[PDB]
Symmetry: C2
Amino acid sequence: AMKPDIYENNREGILCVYKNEKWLVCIKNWKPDNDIEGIAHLEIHHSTDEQFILSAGKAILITAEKENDKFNIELTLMEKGKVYNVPAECWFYSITQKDTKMMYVQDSNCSMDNSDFCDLSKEEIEYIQTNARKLFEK
Amino acid sequence: AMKPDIYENNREGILCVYKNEKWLVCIKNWKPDNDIEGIAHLEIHHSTDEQFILSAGKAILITAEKENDKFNIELTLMEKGKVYNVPAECWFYSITQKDTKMMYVQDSNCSMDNSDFCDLSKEEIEYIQTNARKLFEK
C-alpha cells in the first residue's frame, strides 16, 4: 500500500511543499523579516486569498489598509486550532518567534506579478513593536 | 483596518470554513467513525488530492490499496509540524482521539459525485485496531 507524501520544513523561512494547478501549501518557519526586531514591510496579494494555520510557537498576523501614504494597522494574536484568512487586496504580514511554525494556503499562481510589498514607516514599525511585544504575552 | 477572517470549529466532526472556486479548507474534530472503536470504512477521492495538518491531540492516517476485494493497509502516525498528502485514487481515513483537531485542504468541488466510501472487513477493522492502539503511543 502507498504511504501519504510526508512534508516538513527545517529551513529558515518558507518552503513550499505541495502545489497543483489550483493551490499550494507552504510551511513557514521563523525568518528575520518576521521577527519583532525585523518587521519592515507588509505584503499584499492582488489575486488570491490566503489562509494561515499556526502549528508551533506564537504568532501575530498584521493586517492593514493603506490610507494616503500611511497604514492603518491591526494586530491579531493567532490561536492554535483556528484558521485565519487574509482576503485579496488586504495588506498583511506575520510576526513570529524562533520556534514558530505555521502553514499557509494560497493560489498556485505565486508569481509576484500579482502581489506587492511596501515598506512601513519608522513610527509604524515602532508602533507595531510596542504593541506586539505586549500581545505576544497575552 | 480590516481584521482577517477568523474561523474555528467546536462541533463534532467536520466544519468547512473557507471555500473558493478552486479549494477549500476544513477543520475536523473527533467524530465516532474516526474513533479507534468506530473505524469501519475508508474514503477515496477520484479527482482531488488532499492535504492534512494535525493541530491538537494525536492522529493516525490510514492509507490503502484495494487488491481484489481486500485492502492492503498502511498506518502513519501524524506529527505536528508536518503536512501529509493523500493523492487522488488512494484510499484513506483518519483515526483520532476525543481531543484531536486537524485541518484539511482539497478541491472545492466536494460533491460525492467524484468520491466513494468502502467498508472494511472484520479482519481489517481488528487489524487496524490492534496496530493503531500501539501506534498511538509510539
